[PDB]
Amino acid sequence: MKELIYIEEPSILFAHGQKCTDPRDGLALFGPLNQIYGIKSGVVGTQKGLQ
Amino acid sequence: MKELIYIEEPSILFAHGQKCTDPRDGLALFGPLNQIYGIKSGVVGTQKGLQ
Secondary structure: OOOOOOOOOOOEEOHHHOEEOOHHHHHHHHOOOOOOOOOOOOOOOOHHHHO | OOOOOOOOOOOEEOHHHOEEOOHHHHHHHOOOOOOOOOOOOOOOOOHHHHO
C-alpha cells in the first residue's frame, strides 16, 4: 500500500479580502474584487437573437 | 434703418424629453440622454500628474 499525500485546496481571495475556495460561494458572499460600474452590452445578431 | 430679423433659440433635448436652451442648465435640471454606468478612468502621466 502506497500513501497518498494531500495538497490542501487553495483559497482564492475576494472582496474585503475574504478568501474562499469555490468561485460561486465567494462571489455570492463577498462579491468580486474590483468595482466596475456596469456592463454596456453590445449585441451583434438577428432580431430574434437580440430578443 | 435696415431690418434685423430674429431667429428663435433652438432647444437642445435632455433626459426625459425636457428641452432647454442652455446645455449646462438643461444638464443640471434633467441630465444626459443615455445612462452610461460610470467612467473607468485611466490616467497616463507622472505621479505628480496622478495626484
